[PDB]
Design an enzyme around this catalytic site. Structure first.
Site, PDB file in Angstrom:
ATOM      1  N   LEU A 134       0.832  -1.193   0.000  1.00 39.68           N
ATOM      2  CA  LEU A 134       0.000   0.000   0.000  1.00 39.68           C
ATOM      3  C   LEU A 134       0.874   1.253   0.000  1.00 39.68           C
ATOM      4  O   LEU A 134       2.094   1.192   0.168  1.00 39.68           O
ATOM      5  CB  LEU A 134      -0.946  -0.015   1.205  1.00 39.68           C
ATOM      6  CG  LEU A 134      -2.410  -0.396   0.981  1.00 39.68           C
ATOM      7  CD1 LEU A 134      -2.558  -1.676   0.177  1.00 39.68           C
ATOM      8  CD2 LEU A 134      -3.087  -0.555   2.331  1.00 39.68           C
ATOM      9  N   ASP A 135       0.231   2.401  -0.193  1.00 42.19           N
ATOM     10  CA  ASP A 135       0.926   3.668  -0.357  1.00 42.19           C
ATOM     11  C   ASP A 135       0.914   4.463   0.949  1.00 42.19           C
ATOM     12  O   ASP A 135       0.487   3.973   2.000  1.00 42.19           O
ATOM     13  CB  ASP A 135       0.303   4.462  -1.506  1.00 42.19           C
ATOM     14  CG  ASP A 135       1.342   5.132  -2.379  1.00 42.19           C
ATOM     15  OD1 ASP A 135       2.187   5.872  -1.835  1.00 42.19           O
ATOM     16  OD2 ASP A 135       1.313   4.919  -3.609  1.00 42.19           O
ATOM     17  N   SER A 136       1.400   5.704   0.872  1.00 49.36           N
ATOM     18  CA  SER A 136       1.528   6.550   2.053  1.00 49.36           C
ATOM     19  C   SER A 136       0.190   7.118   2.508  1.00 49.36           C
ATOM     20  O   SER A 136       0.029   7.432   3.692  1.00 49.36           O
ATOM     21  CB  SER A 136       2.518   7.684   1.774  1.00 49.36           C
ATOM     22  OG  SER A 136       3.602   7.215   0.990  1.00 49.36           O
TER      23      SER A 136
END
Ligand SMILES: CCCCCCCCCCC[C@H](O)CC(=O)SCCNC(=O)CCNC(=O)[C@H](O)C(C)(C)COP(=O)(O)O
Lengths: 178, 125, 459, 88, 63, 93, 97, 167, 38, 56, 605
Positions: D42-44
């Protein structure tokens, strides 16, 4: 709260702090959840410019522009929680929060009113007095001699010992007592 | 924009000095974290020492109490600005409320001795 | 009167000839019996003032002061006990002897037929209070505080001696009822104006108003609890009994010499209430509170309304009991934390439930509760000063605003709050301290119940 | 209050119940000991969006200095348990 | 705190119960005197000018 | 404490300015005292005039109502700037 | 360094003895000091003194002044005099200059 | 106790009820039940108390004071005559204050028994009150805290010199 | 905890030849205790 | 009758002994100021034959 | 006569009874919330007796029980004037405190200090009923500051909350400025009328009572939260909910009205203070009806609702129908305490969620609380023949028919349209729309301890305005002949405000962009008066306190002038005296010079 703040907030930390303040001042503004989810994916249609910015001067300039937009379009009364600061019940239950040194000053009638718990607290105090002389020696050898010292305390490196500086964390009163 | 004020200050996230920082300013923030870490480790060691039975003698609170109580007259220098502003703030409203009290009481004594002011039901004066 | 004076003088072999284990219990029990036998002065079935002898007289204004002296002696000897639990026996008995001797000469000063006997036992207070302050004070500045107290009061009291001997060699006997009844009006002369300033300057220093108020907070933060209670609760108002009893000589000159002292009083009480909003030391905050509550009765006896004298005497005994209770609470907090900063010890209601109730009752009598004698005296002084001038009520209104703000500031600072949890040594409240503030407050509740005793000289 | 106290298995089931309702989470891939950066990829934004999910799920505020550090369901369960102070 | 409250109510109540019982009993059984004119040829004594009998007793026996 | 760790005078030299910074446990380059106007401030360090509402709420503090740390220099106007009294928090407008 | 004894630590008197009442640290002397100041101060001085204060008769002549005011108003309204004259002393008794 | 020469109350002129409605009023039923439950043991307790008072019945006398020569007849310098006249004036000052209290109680009772239409039957009580406040303001106004027979004599001589100058 | 007592720096301010110094009293020697000058 | 109890409880005499001596010296001072007795005009009364003194 | 006295002192004795129990050791043995609600229930059952006999015979009583103490000519007789104001407000206050004790026995169940809480509330009702039954104004001060002291003790109930301590200082400050105005009017009245009670102070209508009527105006702003001193009442929503429901909704805030409703015969003959109180209550009604247009905390919205109703009572009090103002008090207290108790029922069912943007669908979740909320908000709005109509319709008729200002007409009609708008805000954002609560739904309103007092306040709000406006005799002049466009105009602007707020609040369901205009900043941010006043008055006050009064005057310059200037002068004199070189030559030259001086002194003498 349980971790520690750094010396400086980084660019990713300030950008995620702006994302958190944006996604709570939105739903402070857009009250219904349909408007919150449509404007939150519009906020994702606003994050997509900040993904692959490579100069970091232009990223800090876009951070200043988005922060000025946030302070211009922010809610005058933001969304607050019952457990958050500035909230409905921020430290409301401080009538319970009387710490564990005050149980030493109880009368022996009230100490005989609770037999087993004071024996187990005597066991916890014996664990304190047999753990502290190796806890305070651990910090003076895991303390770095260089000029930079961090806020986060080291864990129990020795097997069978407790972590250093444990009592003020482990004997806080409960946040929702009753 | 949002204009600053001495009573409604600029926040540090909207502050322009947080966005153009230097490695000497970052070294100052690292040294501020280092001195806060040293003071926090000393306070937490004195907090969780079980040999301690007394309170925490706070040296900066003792310093603030001593500075607000018994340092002001050893650190007095007589300047004309301090002398004029202290003379105004210690003398001025005494002559002002002297003029108010003497004007109102000269008016009341003149109206009593001329008979214009009447004490109709005034028994307990 | 001698049944109150002479067994108090016989309390000295009770101190010096008993066992050191039993000095505190014998002296406190027999001084409570001294207060019980000093309740005998309330037998006024007529407006003829009680004159037991040619030495001593009883006055209706002086009798709640005389029960406050004989009642304030066991309240000091309670509070000195854990203060002197580590000192040795001859210094403990010397402290009890100086307290008892201060009580004896305060009883004898309040029972004064003659004003030069009043001056002798008025300046006889300056030795044992200095013995209490500058030996048993716990900080560095007690030498400077004793020099300040001694020389403020002596540079006030020397022209009081000058004007008393000049008045005596002018007109004859300095007996108070003789010089009440046979006296004449004073001519508007500048030597009589300097006589006014000379005979008033001692009491104008002893009650703190501006120019000369500064000895009180030094000799309250450098005092012990018995010296602080005597200097906040009856020995400061010994000069107020003198300021009452002097003015019958010289009533025609007060209506134009009154104005700078009422001016300095009112702006001093606004500025000392403003001082107490930002104060670090709690004992200094109660000290400047006593400065403001004394500037009120400085204005009230600088006016000569009878209404003012009743509000004056009500403020005397209300301020004495309230400031004695507040200074005893400050000594209790100093006993727990070994400091007097309000900021460093907060949230004390979480560990002391009933000491929060006595803190609430003392500061909520300092903030003037309406059935209490504090708003009874302040409301009658407000009535008299509005009779004096219609524009003066905004100044005392600003004072009552900031006295509510400093009283509930001291409650919200040192009682409510987060409970600072770095103190193990917050031991629970003593039976001594709880009954000491109970024997402070329950006379104020009974004095609220029966205010006929406290009506003063003039109705 | 009238709210029941929260068990560890109930807190784990609630955290997994919100976490399987995200669009880019495979529920067969999702276990309690899986890292958001390198084990589900997943991303930030999505970590702090999981933090907003816990914000409007459990009715209390997680600070961002802890919320940057939280990266997996097991210590988000243990952090929510140690903030609400439950005995198991 | 409860030790102080029990001891304060006990050692106030120890005097305050038979004192209030004595006040109520003397007001029921003895009671106040009514006012009347002074008879001719008789002066009053100095306790006879007061109306409550506790005050009459302490005026005739202490002052 | 002693007379050295107690406050006194004004820093006229940079070595006594550094000595006052290590007295007050502050940084040497951040040690800006009050100006020498004879007002009795002296060597007390001038902090920026921000109240205790403006500090970090979620970080655990040594003095919890003050939101201060142990050995951190207390502001001269801390009783002015306490959480019961006047806030200098940033307004929305 | 000058020869000085160190600071004595404030030991817990409630850890020393449980019935510490604020008096001297001998517990029998402490308990009997509490009984003596409660019986001699709170019992026989506050309650007996409140009884003596409440049964002082005619304090500051108020009850006799109310009865003589009732008798005087009754006498003045019976004989037809005005209820208070303007001058207290008699102008026939006075000597004007 | 209650004496109508110093406290004149007019008697009650309450009307007859005569209820037109068939529903009985609950106030008279509940006050007959209130009388039969409460008032009869209270008046039996008061009958027992008055029986014990008539058994141990004693008398107390109102104190009478002989009039001394006043300060207009006494001599300045003669301290004893000045003190006797000063205490005579203080007794008369106390009874003047309670006479003012008597007229104040009469004014309050007349205003409460007249209600909202107080002026027509409070005109005589307000005339009596304004006469006694004019007499008290001529007698003991602005005397000071140390009011004396000498100071009241000085005020009365000031007013009689003012009236002699006006006449 | 303890009350304040005078130290070396409080006892030495009474230990001069005079209390309040000046420009001309700064050279004043403390006198000998046996009153004999070498 | 124990010597230690008598030595530690003879000190309780003094303040009642001071009370008795104060009342005695006050009643001795009562005998001095009797030059005005049954001569003030408020209380100038004919003496009743059971007494020779009007107040004591 | 005999029963009429002992019923009101039986009310006071039954209120003194839970304080008398709580000193003793019975407080660990009896069920003290149930004991206190039984005591206040029997006190209301006793209090219906003087209500019924005053409804029958209309007799106003002056009861001086204890002659306290007499000073000069002033007596301070403890006295209990019971009339149209005191009898009706003691009955309405005892009924609403019976509701508050039965609500607080359920709501304060988690707090273990409920005995101290209920003792503080019972002592508050002792001070409020001694404010209510005060003849003598020393008793009116005893009530007037005992309610502020018990307001402090009930608002600082959670002692660790610093914002609650800030609200405690704000309440104590603005009640203290009200005490300054009451001290001003009281001291003038005791000087220039020589009494304190209503039976002699009513005679001062022929005098110039402008300065005490200004003092009563300052006291009314102190106790009624008007535009000098409003922010203590919306900041009062940080304490407990029975605290803000009995105190800061029903009985405390109407005391500023109740002072001049008690002082009807002095208000009438002065015409400037009528226009002053009319304008200031109208400005209060606009400001606290425009504050709740976009306000967000639910107790803050109903706090602005009771502040706008308090300003409308000041509008009618300055319009000189104070009996109609008191009719608004005795009809307002029921629905406003119902709306506060319904908000607290939602608070304890949704675990202290006070913002309206995370609560909804209450008419399908809690139907009893929503039905009682719509009867309370509908009686606030003014639907016909509720408890709110039988005051507020006659209020709007008196507003249309008397000589008020034209801007006061426009501003009060606009503020009551805004009252309909904030009632529509509570109905739309609480009872209506699709839900917004946290997903753990713990719903507990099946306790009859919660169910019964909201039923009692709902039966009071359905059956009390008719019974008071029919039982009370005609005590003013009601004029019913007005034009029909001016007669039903309260209902016209109520349905117009409902439709305008419906068409405004239905736009936020639609998908559009929200604008942060300064009108919504003024409405949401409380009109900026706490920000500007509560920072610029403590900064100037404490900065003058430090830099003028503490440091500059007392520490440094009075010390530089009186002690240390003479100390410096005597130090300089001793250093210029005792600085001799020890030579006998210099000593003998000074001896020669002074011998020459003695010779010169003899030669001039
Ligand atoms: C109606 C209301 C109006 C007003 C409403 C409020 C108005 C203001 C809203 C502001 C919202 C805010 O801008 C949201 C955004 O843009 S978020 C972008 C986050 N995207 C990234 O960060 C990229 C991914 N990150 C990484 O690849 C690594 O982190 C990296 C390698 C960079 C770390 O490098 P280093 O550092 O180690």
């Amino acid at each position: 709260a349980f971790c520690a703040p750094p010396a400086y907030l980084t660019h990713q930390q300030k950008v995620l702090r702006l994302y958190k303040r944006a996604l709570r001042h939105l739903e402070s503004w857009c009250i219904h959840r349909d408007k919150y989810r449509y404007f939150a994916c519009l906020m994702r249609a606003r994050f997509e410019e900040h993904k692959n910015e490579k100069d970091m001067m232009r990223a800090t300039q876009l951070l200043r522009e988005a922060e000025e937009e946030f302070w211009q379009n922010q809610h005058p009364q933001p969304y607050i929680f019952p457990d958050s600061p500035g909230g409905t019940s921020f430290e409301r239950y401080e009538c319970y929060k009387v710490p564990e040194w005050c149980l030493d000053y109880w009368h022996p009638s009230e100490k005989a009113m609770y037999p087993d718990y004071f024996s187990k607290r005597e066991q916890w105090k014996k664990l304190r007095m047999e753990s502290w002389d190796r806890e305070v020696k651990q910090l003076q050898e895991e303390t770095s001699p260089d000029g930079i010292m961090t806020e986060a305390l080291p864990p129990a490196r020795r097997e069978g010992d407790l972590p250093p500086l444990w009592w003020h964390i482990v004997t806080r009163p409960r946040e929702r007592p009753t | 924009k949002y204009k600053p004020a001495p009573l409604a200050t600029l926040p540090s996230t909207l502050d322009p000095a947080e966005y153009d920082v230097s490695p000497e300013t970052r070294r100052a923030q690292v040294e501020r974290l280092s001195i806060r870490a040293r003071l926090k480790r000393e306070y937490l060691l004195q907090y969780n020492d079980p040999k301690r039975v007394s309170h925490i003698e706070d040296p900066a609170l003792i310093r603030w109490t001593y500075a607000r109580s018994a340092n002001i007259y050893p650190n007095f220098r007589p300047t004309p600005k301090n002398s004029l502003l202290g003379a105004v703030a210690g003398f001025g409203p005494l002559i002002f409320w002297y003029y108010v009290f003497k004007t109102d009481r000269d008016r009341k004594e003149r109206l009593i001795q001329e008979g214009k002011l009447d004490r109709k039901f005034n028994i307990s004066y | 009167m001698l049944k109150i004076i002479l067994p108090s003088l016989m309390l000295l072999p009770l101190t010096w000839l008993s066992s050191p284990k039993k000095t505190w219990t014998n002296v406190t029990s027999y001084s409570f019996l001294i207060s019980l036998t000093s309740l005998t002065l309330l037998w006024q079935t007529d407006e003829n003032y009680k004159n037991f002898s040619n030495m001593f007289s009883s006055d209706p204004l002086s009798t709640p002061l005389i029960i406050l002296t004989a009642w304030l002696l066991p309240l000091m000897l309670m509070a000195s006990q854990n203060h002197l639990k580590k000192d040795n026996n001859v210094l403990q008995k010397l402290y009890i002897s100086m307290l008892i001797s201060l009580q004896i000469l305060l009883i004898m000063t309040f029972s004064a037929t003659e004003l030069i006997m009043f001056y002798i036992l008025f300046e006889a207070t300056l030795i044992p209070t200095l013995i209490i302050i500058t030996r048993w004070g716990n900080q560095t500045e007690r030498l400077n505080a004793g020099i300040y107290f001694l020389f403020y009061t002596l540079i006030g009291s020397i022209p009081l001696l000058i004007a008393l001997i000049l008045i005596q060699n002018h007109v004859g006997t300095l007996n108070l009822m003789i010089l009440s009844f046979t006296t004449h009006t004073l001519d508007a002369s500048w030597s009589n104006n300097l006589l006014w300033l000379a005979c008033m300057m001692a009491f104008l220093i002893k009650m703190p108003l501006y120019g000369v108020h500064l000895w009180l907070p030094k000799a309250h933060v450098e005092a012990p609890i018995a010296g602080s209670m005597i200097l906040a609760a009856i020995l400061l108002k010994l000069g107020s009994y003198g300021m009452i009893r002097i003015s019958i000589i010289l009533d025609p000159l007060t209506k134009y010499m009154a104005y700078p002292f009422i001016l300095l009083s009112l702006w001093g009480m606004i500025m000392t209430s403003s001082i107490c909003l930002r104060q670090t030391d709690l004992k200094s905050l109660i000290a400047y509170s006593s400065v403001s509550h004394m500037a009120l009765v400085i204005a009230s006896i600088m006016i000569q309304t009878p209404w003012s004298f009743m509000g004056a005497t009500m403020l005397m005994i209300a301020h004495g009991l309230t400031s004695s209770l507040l200074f005893c609470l400050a000594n209790s907090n100093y006993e727990r934390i070994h400091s007097r900063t309000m900021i460093m010890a907060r949230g004390l209601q979480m560990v002391f439930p009933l000491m929060a109730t006595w803190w609430l009752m003392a500061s909520l009598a300092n903030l003037a509760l309406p059935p209490s004698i504090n708003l009874m005296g302040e409301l009658f002084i407000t009535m008299s000063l509005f009779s004096w001038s219609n524009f003066t009520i905004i100044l005392m209104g600003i004072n009552i605003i900031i006295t509510g703000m400093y009283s509930m500031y001291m409650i919200i600072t040192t009682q409510r709050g987060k409970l600072t949890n770095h103190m193990i040594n917050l031991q629970p409240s003593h039976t001594r301290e709880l009954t000491l503030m109970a024997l402070h407050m329950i006379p104020l509740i009974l004095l609220t119940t029966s205010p006929k005793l406290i009506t003063g000289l003039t109705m | 209050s009238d709210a029941p106290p929260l068990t560890l298995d109930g807190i784990k089931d609630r955290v997994l119940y919100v976490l399987k309702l995200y669009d880019k989470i495979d529920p067969e891939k999702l276990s309690v000991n899986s890292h958001f950066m390198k084990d589900l990829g997943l991303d930030s934004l999505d970590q702090v969006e999981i933090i907003m999910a816990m914000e409007d799920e459990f009715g209390f505020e997680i600070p961002d200095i802890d919320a940057e550090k939280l990266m997996c369901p097991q210590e988000i369960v243990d952090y929510i348990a140690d903030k609400k102070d439950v005995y198991e | 705190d409860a030790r102080f409250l029990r001891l304060m109510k006990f050692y106030l109540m120890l005097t305050g119960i038979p004192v209030i019982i004595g006040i109520t009993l003397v007001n029921i059984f003895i009671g106040e005197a009514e006012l009347a004119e002074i008879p001719e040829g008789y002066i009053p004594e100095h306790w006879e000018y007061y109306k409550h009998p506790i005050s009459r007793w302490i005026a005739r026996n202490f002052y | 404490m002693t007379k050295d760790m107690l406050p006194g005078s004004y820093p006229r030299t940079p070595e006594e300015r550094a000595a006052a910074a290590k007295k007050y446990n502050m940084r040497v380059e951040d040690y800006e005292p009050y100006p020498d106007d004879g007002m009795g401030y002296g060597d007390y360090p001038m902090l920026p005039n921000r109240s205790q509402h403006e500090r970090d709420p979620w970080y655990q503090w040594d003095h919890s109502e003050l939101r201060m740390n142990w050995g951190e220099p207390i502001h001269w106007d801390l009783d002015m700037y306490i959480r019961n009294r006047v806030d200098t928090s940033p307004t929305p407008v | 360094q000058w020869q000085e004894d160190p600071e004595p630590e404030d030991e817990n008197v409630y850890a020393k003895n449980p019935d510490f009442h604020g008096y001297d640290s001998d517990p029998v002397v402490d308990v009997w000091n509490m009984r003596a100041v409660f019986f001699f101060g709170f019992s026989i001085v506050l309650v007996f003194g409140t009884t003596f204060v409440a049964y002082v008769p005619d304090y500051r002549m108020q009850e006799w002044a109310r009865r003589e005011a009732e008798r005087l108003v009754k006498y003045r309204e019976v004989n037809g005099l005005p209820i208070m004259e303007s001058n207290y002393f008699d102008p026939s008794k006075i000597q004007l200059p | 106790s209650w004496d109508k020469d110093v406290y004149p109350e007019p008697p009650s002129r309450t009307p007859a009820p005569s209820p037109q409605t068939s529903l009985p009023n609950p106030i008279t039923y509940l006050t007959k039940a209130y009388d039969l439950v409460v008032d009869w043991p209270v008046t039996l307790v008061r009958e027992f108390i008055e029986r014990q008072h008539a058994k141990n019945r004693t008398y107390y006398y109102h104190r009478q004071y002989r009039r001394v020569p006043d300060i207009t007849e006494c001599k300045e310098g003669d301290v004893l005559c000045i003190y006797e006249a000063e205490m005579q004036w203080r007794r008369d000052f106390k009874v003047d204050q309670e006479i003012m209290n008597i007229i104040q109680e009469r004014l309050k009772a007349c205003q409460q028994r007249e209600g909202e239409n107080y002026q027509q039957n409070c005109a005589k009580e307000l005339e009596q009150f304004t006469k006694v406040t004019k007499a008290y303001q001529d007698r003991y106004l602005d005397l000071g805290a140390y009011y004396s027979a000498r100071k009241c004599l000085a005020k009365q001589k000031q007013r009689m010199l003012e009236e002699r100058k006006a006449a | 905890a303890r009350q304040w007592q005078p130290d070396i720096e409080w006892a030495e301010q009474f230990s001069g030849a005079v209390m309040y110094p000046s420009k001309e009293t700064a050279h004043w020697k403390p006198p000998p205790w046996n009153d004999v000058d070498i | 009758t124990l010597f230690q109890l008598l030595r530690e409880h003879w000190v309780h005499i003094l303040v009642p002994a001071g009370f008795v001596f104060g009342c005695y010296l006050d009643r001795k001072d009562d005998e001095k100021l009797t030059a005005f007795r049954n001569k003030s005009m408020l209380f100038q009364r004919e003496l009743r034959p059971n007494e020779e003194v009007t107040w004591k | 006569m005999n029963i009429f006295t002992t019923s009101i002192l039986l009310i006071f004795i039954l209120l003194l009874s839970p304080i008398l129990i709580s000193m003793s050791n019975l407080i660990k043995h009896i069920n003290f919330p149930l004991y206190t609600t039984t005591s206040i229930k029997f006190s209301f059952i006793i209090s219906l007796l003087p209500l019924l006999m005053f409804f029958h015979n209309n007799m106003e009583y002056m009861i001086t029980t204890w002659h306290w103490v007499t000073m000069n000519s002033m007596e301070l007789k403890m006295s209990f004037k019971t009339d149209f104001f005191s009898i009706l407000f003691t009955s309405v206050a005892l009924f609403v405190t019976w509701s508050i004790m039965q609500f607080s026995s359920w709501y304060m169940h988690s707090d273990p200090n409920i005995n101290r809480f209920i003792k503080y509330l019972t002592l508050f009702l002792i001070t409020m009923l001694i404010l209510t039954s005060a003849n003598n104004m020393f008793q009116l001060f005893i009530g007037w500051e005992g309610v502020g002291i018990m307001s402090f003790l009930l608002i600082g109930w959670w002692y660790g909350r610093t914002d609650a301590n800030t609200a405690a200082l704000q309440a104590i400050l603005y009640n203290r400025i009200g005490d300054i105005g009451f001290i001003l009017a009281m001291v003038w009245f005791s000087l220039n009328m020589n009494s304190w009670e209503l039976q002699q102070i009513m005679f001062s209508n022929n005098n110039d009572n402008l300065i005490p009527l200004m003092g009563l105006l300052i006291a009314a702003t102190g106790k009624s939260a008007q535009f000098g001193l409003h922010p203590w009442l919306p900041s009062a929503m940080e304490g407990p909910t029975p605290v803000s429901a009995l105190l800061h909704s029903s009985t405390m805030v109407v005391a500023g009205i109740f002072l001049l409703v008690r002082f009807h015969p002095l208000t009438t003959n002065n015409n400037f203070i009528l226009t002053t109180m009319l304008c200031l209550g109208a400005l209060t009604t606009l400001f606290t009806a425009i504050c709740a247009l976009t306000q967000n905390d639910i107790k803050k919205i109903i706090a602005f609702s009771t502040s706008s109703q308090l300003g409308l009572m000041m509008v009618t009090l300055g319009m000189n129908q104070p009996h109609l103002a008191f009719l608004h008090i005795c009809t307002h207290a029921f629905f406003k305490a119902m709306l506060f108790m319904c908000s607290g029922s939602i608070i304890h069912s949704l675990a202290d969620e006070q913002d309206i943007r995370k609560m909804g669908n209450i008419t399908k979740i809690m139907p009893f609380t929503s039905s009682c909320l719509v009867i309370g908000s509908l009686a606030l709005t003014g639907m016909p023949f509720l408890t709110g109509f039988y005051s507020k319709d006659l209020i709007i008729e008196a507003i249309n028919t008397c000589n008020t200002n034209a801007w006061a007409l426009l501003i009060t009609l606009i503020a009551t349209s805004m009252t309909a708008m904030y009632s529509m805000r509570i109905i739309y954002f609480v009872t209506m729309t699709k839900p917004r609560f946290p997903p753990l739904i713990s719903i507990n309103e099946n306790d009859p301890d919660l169910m019964n007092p909201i039923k009692r306040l709902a039966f009071g709000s359905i059956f009390a305005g008719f019974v008071i406006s029919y039982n009370i005799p005609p005590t003013s002049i009601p004029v019913l002949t007005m034009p029909w466009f001016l007669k039903t105009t309260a209902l016209i602007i109520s349905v117009l405000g409902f439709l305008i707020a419906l068409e405004l609040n239905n736009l936020t369901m639609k998908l559009s962009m929200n604008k942060a205009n300064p009108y919504s900043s003024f409405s949401t941010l409380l009109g900026f008066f706490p920000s500007i006043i509560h920072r610029i008055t403590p900064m100037k006050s404490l900065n003058l306190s430090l830099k003028t009064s503490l440091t500059l005057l007392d520490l440094i310059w009075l010390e530089k002038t009186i002690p240390k200037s003479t100390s410096t002068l005597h130090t300089n004199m001793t250093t210029l005296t005792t600085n001799q070189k020890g030579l006998i030559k210099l000593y003998f030259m000074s001896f020669l010079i002074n011998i020459i001086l003695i010779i010169i002194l003899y030669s001039i003498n």
